[PDB]
UniProtKB/Swiss-Prot annotation, chain B:
Entry-listed glycosylation sites: N62, N145, N253
Motif WSXWS motif, residue numbers: 251-255
Intracellular or extracellular location(s): Cell membrane; Basolateral cell membrane
Source species: Mus musculus (Mouse)
Protein name: Leptin receptor
Classification lineage: Eukaryota, Metazoa, Chordata, Craniata, Vertebrata
From Swiss-Prot, chain C:
UniProt lineage: Eukaryota, Metazoa, Chordata, Craniata, Vertebrata
Keywords attached to this entry: Diabetes mellitus, Disulfide bond, Obesity, Secreted, Signal
GO molecular function annotation: DNA binding; hormone activity; leptin receptor binding; peptide hormone receptor binding
SUPFAM superfamilies: 4-helical cytokines
Gene source species: Mus musculus
InterPro entries (alphabetical): 4_helix_cytokine-like_core (IPR009079), Leptin (IPR000065)
Domain of life: Eukaryota
The protein's name in its UniProt record: Leptin
Disulfide bonds listed in the record: C97-C140
Pathology noted in the entry: Defects in Lep are the cause of profound obesity and type II diabetes.
Keyword Signal set for record: yes
Biological processes per GO annotation: activation of protein kinase C activity; adipose tissue development; adult feeding behavior; angiogenesis; aorta development; bile acid metabolic process; bone growth; bone mineralization involved in bone maturation
Phenotype upon gene inactivation: Mutants are severely obese and sterile. Animals have an increased bone formation leading to high bone mass. Have impaired T-cell immunity, Th2 responses are favoured in mutants. CD4(+)CD25(-) T-cells of mutant mice show high levels of autophagy.
Its biological purpose: Key player in the regulation of energy balance and body weight control. Once released into the circulation, has central and peripheral effects by binding LEPR, found in many tissues, which results in the activation of several major signaling pathways. In the hypothalamus, acts as an appetite-regulating factor that induces a decrease in food intake and an increase in energy consumption by inducing anorexinogenic factors and suppressing orexigenic neuropeptides, also regulates bone mass and secretion of hypothalamo-pituitary-adrenal hormones.
GO CC terms of this entry: cytoplasm; cytosol; extracellular region; extracellular space
Length: 308, 260, 140
């Protein structure tokens, strides 16, 4: 008889969907299937029960402002196993207005879209009335709007401009509104100047490579790690700088002039070095346009000697 | 044990108790590492081993200070030069704030709080108050907690609005008036304060050394001025500064130079 | 002891000072103060603030809101709001009259940006109204 599943957790996916995850029995030497009995106390209350072999379950199109109570039981996959007792019920609650995605981090000139689900007194208003708003200042033009469905509204921004900071905030606040009625919740937009010119230079003894870059753009996002990633293949650079996905990070150090510098020593003199800059935020990861190099071609000459 | 204290300053509390008195004390000039006076009460000519100490301390601390140009941080400076002889005691700033303005008598309201301060390379301790009530009454002084007890500087109070540093007036333009040859000067007032302001203007011919002539504007509504210049075809360097019309503040730094 | 004309002038200068402060938050000047936003209905926005006790309780709520916003400028300004309430206390003492004395956290985590920008532009409107009526014989 298997033990009840534990670690009952619910999270909301990027697509606005519900994922329920629970911890399987590591001590069990046998495969386990799990029955998840979940009830939603929305405006329409319903109950369902499913059987899943994995430790995760996905439910599409979660309703705003709804309660979700979940119980899970486990059973042995092979043989006449006995269903375990139900797990401790876990309750997850949703909010007023739904976004698709909650947030976006991207670069300049991209094509980033969005969708909103607006709730107005338990009435999912038609998308024809949903109005997109940028930071409570200017309304988004209707031309960029789109109707995914009558209830789902959509907008899109092509040729994204760099998010110009306003105060300490580094993200555009996007609202969807019931005509002149605007709710309080929003979505965050981060557009960053990802174009970084890495300046590598070679010592006179052909032993070490000092690389520099000014992250003047990046000193606005906190909570995001910044690092340099690189990969080297046998010889030379393919004419299209690209990432063999196997990459490794290089530790680099700040300088008094605000630049980040780091040195490679010793060096593979005739070998192709590709590198770029990785920014790992809670939202995800952003990478600079990759650049490659041959060390031998980037050597600063030593001064001529023995001059009379 | 240097000179006998006069009998006039002596007193007989009882046949068993002797007394000395020092009215209108002068500063105890330190000798060696002994800032005090080492008093000895003795059986006539020669003495017992017992000894006592008398301290006169120049605790009159000149606490002078300034509010920033944004009314968002205020800083006070005081030089603990006198206390640069005593060790074993603690020196700090103690301040009491009550709701609005200062009572006519700067005095220690019994409830008070300490203020952390940092010594600078200039030999002055500076204390930065932020956040800011613009119109609260802040009295403060210097507390010396020695093994003897607590000494306190003459308390002084402050209203921050009085010690606001005026920002230099912005957007100053100097030009040569057409058909009259006058120097026309315009400027933009600093965002603060709300008081009426007097304005001082220094102007001269452009050069390495500039003879600074001065003109004064007494009405705040006047945002512009015109003056006579001997040379009508030479570059003139002009700077402007502003002060509160009532003068309860400081003189702003000279504005950026304007070249005709 | 307390000069009432001086207190009235200092009150006006302080109001205009706060107005300039709100003018320095670049992102707030372009947001419609009167625009209604669902969820922040507890903030005492534009709703005729026509009496000293209502003015006092309005500024008290605004202070309680600002205490939770993590910006340094608005916090010291909340301190200025303390000075403003004390000035109104002196004015009510001048006119003779007694003056008596939750969901914000949830919106603070989920939507901080909206809460500050709205709280500030509605505050600016409330104070601008107060200014336009701090001379038509304010009453307790
Ligand atoms: Ni390869
Ligand atoms: Ni008192």
């Amino acid at each position: 008889k298997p033990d009840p599943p534990l670690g009952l957790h619910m999270e909301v996916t990027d697509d606005g969907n519900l994922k329920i995850s629970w911890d399987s029995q590591t001590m069990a030497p046998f495969p386990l299937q799990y029955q998840v009995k979940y009830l939603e106390n929305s405006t329409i209350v319903r109950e369902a029960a499913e059987i899943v072999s994995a430790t995760s379950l996905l439910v599409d199109s979660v309703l705003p402002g709804s309660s979700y109570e979940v119980q899970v039981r486990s059973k042995r996959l092979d043989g006449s196993g006995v269903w375990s007792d139900w797990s401790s019920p876990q309750v997850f609650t949703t909010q007023d207005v739904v976004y698709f995605p909650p947030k976006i981090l991207t670069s300049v000139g991209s094509n980033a879209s969005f969708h909103c689900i607006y709730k107005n007194e338990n009435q999912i208003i038609s998308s024809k009335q949903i109005v997109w708003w940028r930071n409570l200042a200017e309304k988004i033009p209707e031309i960029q709007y789109s109707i995914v469905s009558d209830r789902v509204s959509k907008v899109t921004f092509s040729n994204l401009k760099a998010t110009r900071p306003r105060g300490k905030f580094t993200y555009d606040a996007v609202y969807c509104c019931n005509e002149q009625a605007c709710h309080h919740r929003y979505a965050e937009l981060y557009v960053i100047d990802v174009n970084i010119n890495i300046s590598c230079e070679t010592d006179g003894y052909l032993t070490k490579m000092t690389c520099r870059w000014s992250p003047s753009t990046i000193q606005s996002l906190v909570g995001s790690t910044v690092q340099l990633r690189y990969h080297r293949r046998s010889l030379y650079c393919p004419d299209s700088p690209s990432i063999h996905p196997t990459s490794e990070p290089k530790n680099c150090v700040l300088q008094r002039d605000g630049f980040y510098e780091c040195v490679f020593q010793p060096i593979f003199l005739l070998s192709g070095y590709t590198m770029w800059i990785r920014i790992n935020h809670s939202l995800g990861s952003l990478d600079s346009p990759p650049t490659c190099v041959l060390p031998d071609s980037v050597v600063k000459p030593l001064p001529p000697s023995n001059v009379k | 044990l240097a000179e006998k204290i006069p009998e006039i300053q002596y007193s007989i509390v009882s046949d068993r108790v002797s007394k000395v008195t020092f009215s209108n004390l002068k500063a105890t000039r330190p000798r060696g590492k002994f800032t005090y006076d080492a008093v000895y009460c003795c059986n006539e000519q020669a003495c017992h081993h017992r000894y006592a100490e008398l301290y006169v301390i120049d605790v009159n601390i000149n606490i002078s200070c300034e509010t920033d140009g944004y009314l968002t941080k205020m800083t006070c400076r005081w030089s603990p030069s006198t206390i640069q002889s005593l060790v074993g005691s603690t020196v700090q700033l103690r301040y009491h704030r009550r709701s609005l303005y200062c009572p006519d008598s700067p005095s220690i309201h019994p409830t008070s709080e300490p203020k952390n301060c940092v010594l600078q390379r200039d030999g002055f301790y500076e204390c930065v108050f932020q956040p800011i009530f613009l119109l609260s009454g802040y009295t403060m002084w210097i507390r010396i907690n020695h093994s003897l007890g607590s000494l306190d500087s003459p308390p002084t109070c402050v209203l921050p609005d009085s010690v606001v540093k005026p920002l230099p007036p912005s957007n100053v333009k100097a030009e040569i008036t057409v058909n009259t040859g006058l120097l026309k000067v315009s400027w933009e007032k600093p965002v603060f304060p709300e008081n009426n302001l007097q304005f001082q203007i220094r102007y001269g011919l452009s050069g390495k050394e500039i003879q600074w002539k001065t003109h004064e504007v007494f009405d705040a509504k006047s945002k512009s001025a015109s003056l006579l210049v001997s040379d009508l075809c030479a570059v003139y360097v002009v700077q402007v500064r502003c002060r509160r019309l009532d003068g309860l503040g400081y003189w702003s730094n000279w504005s950026s130079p304007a070249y005709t | 002891g307390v000069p009432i004309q001086k207190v009235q002038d200092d009150t006006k200068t302080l109001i205009k000072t706060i107005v300039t402060r709100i003018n320095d938050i670049s992102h707030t000047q372009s947001v419609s103060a009167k625009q209604r936003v669902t969820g922040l209905d507890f903030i005492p926005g534009l709703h005729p603030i026509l009496s000293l006790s209502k003015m006092d309780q309005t500024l008290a709520v605004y202070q309680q809101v600002l205490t939770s916003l993590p910006s340094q400028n608005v916090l010291q300004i909340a301190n200025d709001l303390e000075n403003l309430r004390d000035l109104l206390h002196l004015l009510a003492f001048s006119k003779s009259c007694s003056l008596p004395q939750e969901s914000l956290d949830g919106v603070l985590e989920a939507s901080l940006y909206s809460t500050e920008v709205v709280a500030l532009s509605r505050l600016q409107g409330s104070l601008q109204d107060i200014l336009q009526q701090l001379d038509v014989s304010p009453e307790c």
